[PDB]
Amino acid sequence: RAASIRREALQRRSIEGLPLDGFDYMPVGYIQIPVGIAGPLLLDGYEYSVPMATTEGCLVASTNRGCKAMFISGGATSTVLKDGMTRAPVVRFASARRASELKFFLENPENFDTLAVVFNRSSRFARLQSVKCTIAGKNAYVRFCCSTGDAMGMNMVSKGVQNVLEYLTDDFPDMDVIGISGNFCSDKKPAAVNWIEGRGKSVVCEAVIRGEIVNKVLKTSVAALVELNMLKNLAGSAVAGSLGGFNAHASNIVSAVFIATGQDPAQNVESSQCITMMEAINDGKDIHISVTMPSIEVGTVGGGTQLASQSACLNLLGVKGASTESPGMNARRLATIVAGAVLAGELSLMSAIAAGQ
Amino acid sequence: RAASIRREALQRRSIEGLPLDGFDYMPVGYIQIPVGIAGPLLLDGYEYSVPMATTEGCLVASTNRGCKAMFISGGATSTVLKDGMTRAPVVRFASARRASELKFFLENPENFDTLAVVFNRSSRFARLQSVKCTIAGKNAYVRFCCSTGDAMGMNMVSKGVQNVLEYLTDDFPDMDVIGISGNFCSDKKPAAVNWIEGRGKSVVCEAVIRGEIVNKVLKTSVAALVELNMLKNLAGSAVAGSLGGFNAHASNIVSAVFIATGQDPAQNVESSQCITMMEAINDGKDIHISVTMPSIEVGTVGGGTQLASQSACLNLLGVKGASTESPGMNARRLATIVAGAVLAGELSLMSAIAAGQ
Amino acid sequence: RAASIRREALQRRSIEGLPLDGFDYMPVGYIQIPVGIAGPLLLDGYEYSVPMATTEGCLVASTNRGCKAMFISGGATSTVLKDGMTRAPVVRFASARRASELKFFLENPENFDTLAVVFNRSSRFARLQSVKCTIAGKNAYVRFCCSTGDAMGMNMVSKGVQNVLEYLTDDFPDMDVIGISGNFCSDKKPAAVNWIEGRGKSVVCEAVIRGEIVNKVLKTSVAALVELNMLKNLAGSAVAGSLGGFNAHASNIVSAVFIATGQDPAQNVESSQCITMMEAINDGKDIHISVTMPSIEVGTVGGGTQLASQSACLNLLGVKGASTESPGMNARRLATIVAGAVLAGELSLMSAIAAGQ
Amino acid sequence: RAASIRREALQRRSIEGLPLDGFDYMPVGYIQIPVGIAGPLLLDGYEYSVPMATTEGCLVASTNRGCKAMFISGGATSTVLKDGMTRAPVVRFASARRASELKFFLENPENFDTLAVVFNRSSRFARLQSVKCTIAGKNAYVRFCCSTGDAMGMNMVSKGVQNVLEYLTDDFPDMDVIGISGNFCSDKKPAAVNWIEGRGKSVVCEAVIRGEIVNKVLKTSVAALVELNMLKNLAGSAVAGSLGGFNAHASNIVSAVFIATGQDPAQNVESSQCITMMEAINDGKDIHISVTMPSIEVGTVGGGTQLASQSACLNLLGVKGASTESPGMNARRLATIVAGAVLAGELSLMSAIAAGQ
Ligand SMILES: O=C(O)C[C@H](O)C[C@H](O)/C=C/c1c(C2CC2)nc2ccccc2c1-c1ccc(F)cc1
Ligand SMILES: O=C(O)C[C@H](O)C[C@H](O)/C=C/c1c(C2CC2)nc2ccccc2c1-c1ccc(F)cc1
Ligand SMILES: O=C(O)C[C@H](O)C[C@H](O)/C=C/c1c(C2CC2)nc2ccccc2c1-c1ccc(F)cc1
Ligand SMILES: O=C(O)C[C@H](O)C[C@H](O)/C=C/c1c(C2CC2)nc2ccccc2c1-c1ccc(F)cc1
């Protein structure tokens, strides 16, 4: 209604193509990104039609060729290694010695259940896992890690940090809270702390392609792919001084799935973090392929996940909304689907390159 | 038509919310992301209504508060430092000594005009700027850099690499082209080569906020902001082992503008690269604020830029399509608008945090 | 005797300057590095004459000027944040799922006392602190961390890894031990895992210089130094894409002390890791200066620590040999002396630069 | 004489072992490090007895086993890729736009011969190669690169920076020189700018070991070594978030040679930067092994190179003093000897690990 009057305000230059009617509502319209399907992606038993919101189009095709090569090869096996969202306030004291005392306090086992109880009023779903106090001079970067059910859970983890931050004025009234975020989290930035430590769902996803299928179907060899993986994704990314960028195009696939399933597209910068491994097995006859992804940040609940169209795309994958089984399970399964689509993407583009030789 | 029949194929589980009718066309539908406006953004003289495709909504508001604080403070001044898209094939020889000879050849000035002529049949718009051969053992990572007009120009730079790669079999028939990309570019990955060297448009954007406006309007002080910038964006990102992540949330703003203007959302991982500087000036009375962004990768031509809705959003900014003035100027101006919206974003969220103390 | 005959073998070109007589003994001689003294370094109460083995000479002077400025300013306060040496074997399995099972096993609390008992036959002094299994495809990088008394303790931690690696063939006979080191430790290399996680003694060291002393003695101001620290050591090292290099010259001081006290000079690459913080305190009247150093790797026992000359230099500092008080205390105190000399070094050179303006 | 009286001052606690007599002279004594020989190292035709100053002793043995395996395998071939020492002042202006104008000025070709003439009064040997102005907000980090003959040449490059910095007050009187170093050089710190760009001598060194020698002599296989190189030195260093640390122990060998030849042992942090490549050649029959080292910083002239003992060690290698042939050639040849000894070190320890399986 108003958003309709606000559009004519702006043209009084033309924003004519931008549709207004079609979406249920400071909005001035909406853009449209077409959705392609990659599948079947055979993953931990189940088949998935992977929705990919993208303009490219040759990317849906490329991810498709990868899902097929894995479909006839046994499919993919994902393993969730760690599941927990993080927020890291920077606080400070008058001294590093004093700041150290907050560290040793927070990192004492015997204090945990108290810090936990305080943190977990943040919601029904907040369950604090750990606290890592990093000291730099008289400043402390306190990394809180917690499970958050099927929500990506950034407000939740913040309600909880503030709970423990208020509770801490009892013992530490000299503490100055400089920021609710000190970039030690690290949110929507590439950071070693996320690579080393994990942020959100840390996933590994693997498949074995048989020599016969690498020749007949990918029109390359086991040895050519193992070598191209070492020279491009490992030695190449190393020579370029990459952080977490030891892969061919995880970012294309992660972005496309994120935008279709209504994730935060800015969290794609650390969610795209990936090492691609390609290892000759069975006296060089077959290839073991994996993606290891320490910081896939997704939810099936909240944000853009509950818009009509994005909701339809989660529902296709059967992860729409909170888990009935147990809270967190739909968000965990979404992460493995991303790791699986990434693995297919790596295999397709890595074969295309190696085959082109 | 077919895409309509393909949707029912998939439900034979429900993808009901996903709209089908509304977009002109393997598409199975399209998703809808609402567009907010941040402005006026006063930048290098002109005012802009900045389209931001996002679900958050508090992000459009936050970027708005920043554009206003800069509107009453003189507005922002952008400077384009470097403009050129890169592709880096990995080739190899039997020896490092032999690979060195390709390096010293390519990097000889007197060879450039020949390599240029060969490269520039890629299109009317391809103009090769440089070639940087990095040797690792007997492998060479040859970074080609070229201007590409108003197209982001990744196909163009590839047509050109292949031109020079074929031409090189004259002098180097022993060369094996292992990959058209060796991850030394580095495309859709965070890499030191992009931070150090630049990729696409390298922009700096700056404003001065007066003490009076920092107190009256941002409800903080000059000293509080300079300090929070050092502890969060500099010392914080350092303690976290960040690469290019010396900022608060460039990624939120870059993503939102990228998705609205039909850019490649996976290029957000290196386009979000940013150092935020906040420096007390005029005997501590005022604050100089900047973003330095070495790798903003955008075009106003091709890909998703020519869909109805994304086109309407570029046209709002007056950068839609190729430059009349001269090829490249619309893509350059789009980059500065991104740097300007990022600066507003940094100022808003950095003030909100500092003010909260 | 033989080493004397072996020298003439080599000249049959002249190695005449290289002394032979003077050292008690495949040695062919010995080189001589002159030792300077920086002090008094007033640190956690005590005064130290800091031995610095260096050719420069202007470096001993520069470190001296820093120790004096801190002597009249109250001296330095060190805090040991973490103390533990690490070794990280790479092992592998046929699958990532299988490799995950070693991770979840090792990282189960209830298994720790068993892994501990097995590990701690390595010596009287080996006390295992933790095990962090990082999975990459079907490979596992198992980071063992342990206290090792006053020895730097790299053989000790290795005897212990092999203990747990043999013990693991019970439950994991399918495990292949690919290497006793998989570069995830990371020994004598700069690595994010050491910055984020710590390796050996993690130290913070701090002093307050009064406005009066910054003007009268360092011939600069509080504001000039805070600013130069932000532009050089923080924004500068960031623009350069530094890892752990957020300081002016920790490496000069660490090297000089390491070579004099008979440490391993190749461990200087991660022992020099340092963030220098300089913060205005007391309404801008005074400056809080610190070094935070996550990976100082030293011992007072074994290796070159027990040569005549290197031993004399440890004995000057009163840390020579194993701790009577309790095992580890001399190696811990040596680390704080290094952090203190580094802080003096930073203050001296950072003042010299700022004063030169 | 005085240094003799200064020793008794300090004991009035015992520094008895530290020798006083034996060295020609604020010195209070000297320490002694024993020198071992690794060789013959067969490199670019010539044989070398490589002096290694180290306490370990098992390290000289390990480097010896590598030199022998290469002696019977054809020896090593080094290639110098780039030769130039760098200093990077941070200067600033009132604006980024203004700072940009210094960048575009300095980086204009037509200005170079003038900047060169000004720079090159620094000495007979200073020959300026390039200037790279990096802008961050209103600050500029100007990387000067120059040849410096056989001196490591850090004073020389500084005399030259100051020459151009004074000359710049003509055109840029508004410039503030904040520091003669802004950590963008980056001296005695690990930095992406050194990895990407090079600092001092950038060397590649390669050898081919035949299947027969890998079995008979190194007691492993071609395939085992290629694999261990990928899992340890590449995937391992990547998982650890390494910068320039894509090798097993370059730092051990670089340190040992640096200390014996009187180099600056603090420059070992960036001189140890290394990617180790191991590639199966000749239908998997043989192994191509290399080290690529972008920042070996050495001189044969000045500093500790002209002490009796360190001089004797350079003279063994035939690189002592300035080049007769042409200035720089002895310092260049020393770098290749370091790269060669590193390659031998990698081969020995990498074989020992792989063979242990
Ligand atoms: O390679 C990288 O470092 C990442 C890459 O840039 C991301 C980009 O979206 C992918 C581009 C791409 C694709 C896209 C379908 C995803 N398909 C191909 C099929 C056959 C042969 C090459 C390609 C290339 C392709 C074409 C030219 C290249 F130089 C590289 C890849
Ligand atoms: O801070 C960072 O490292 C990046 C951040 O995570 C990205 C995130 O999209 C921003 C979250 C955010 C916002 C969003 C409008 C963009 N607005 C605020 C307004 C007042 C106070 C805090 C915030 C926070 C906010 C709330 C809680 C926090 F912990 C941090 C920021
Ligand atoms: O600055 C850095 O990034 C690290 C530096 O390179 C390490 C080097 O050993 C130090 C060089 C140095 C020294 C040495 C005594 C340690 N003293 C000075 C005193 C007054 C003014 C400058 C200096 C400089 C000095 C001279 C010229 C410079 F460009 C920088 C520092
Ligand atoms: O591996 C790394 O990441 C680097 C390493 O730490 C540096 C260290 O100076 C080397 C230690 C070393 C050596 C030294 C002679 C240099 N020799 C061996 C011979 C046979 C088998 C193992 C080793 C190990 C050795 C022993 C135990 C290990 F865990 C690793 C290497």
Numbering used by the authors:
A (entry chain A), B (entry chain A), C (entry chain A), D (entry chain A): 198 to 209, 213 to 225, 235 to 566
Give sentences from the paper.
HMGR (3-hydroxy-3-methylglutaryl-coenzyme A reductase) is the rate limiting enzyme of the eukaryotic mevalonate pathway successfully targeted by statins to treat hypercholesterolemia in humans. As HMGR inhibitors have been shown to be herbicidal, HMGR could represent a mode of action target for the development of herbicides. Here, we present the crystal structure of a HMGR from Arabidopsis thaliana (AtHMG1) which exhibits a wider active site than previously determined structures from different species. By contrast, the conserved extracellular domain of AtHMG1 shares ~54% sequence identity with HsHMGCR and strictly conserved catalytic residues.
To develop plant-specific statins and mitigate off-target effects, we solved the crystal structure of the core domain of apo AtHMG1 and in complex with pitavastatin to resolutions of 1.9 and 2.1 Å, respectively, in space groupI 41 2 2. Conserved polar interactions occur with the residues local to the cis loop Arg296, Ser390, Asp396, Lys397, Lys398, Asn461 (HsHMGCR Arg590, Ser684, Asp690, Lys691, Lys692, Asn755) and a salt-bridge between the terminal carboxylate of the HMG moiety with Lys441 (HsHMGCR Lys735). The fluorophenyl group of pitavastatin maintains conserved stacking interactions with Arg296 (HsHMGCR Arg590) and hydrophobic interactions between the quinoline and cyclopropyl moiety with residues Leu268, Ile389, Leu558, Asp561 (HsHMGCR Leu562, Val683, Leu853, Asp856). This complex structure however also revealed two notable differences between the binding mode of class II statins in AtHMG1 and HsHMGCR; (i) loss of hydrogen bonding to the O5-hydroxyl group of the HMG moiety of statins from Glu265 (HsHMGCR Glu559), despite a slight shift of Glu265 towards the bound inhibitor, and (ii) the loss of hydrophobic interactions with Gly266, His458 and Ile562 (HsHMGCR Gly560, His752 and Leu857). Attempts were made to crystallise type I statins; however, electron density for these ligands was ambiguous. Modelling with AtHMG1 revealed more varied poses of the analogues, with similar affinities between the most favourable binding modes. These binding modes are possibly facilitated by a wider active site and flexibility in the Lβ2-Lα1 loop region and might account for the difficulty we had in obtaining co-crystal structures for AtHMG1. Our insights from the crystal structure of a model plant HMGR and the binding mode of pitavastatin provided the opportunity to rationally design plant-specific inhibitors.
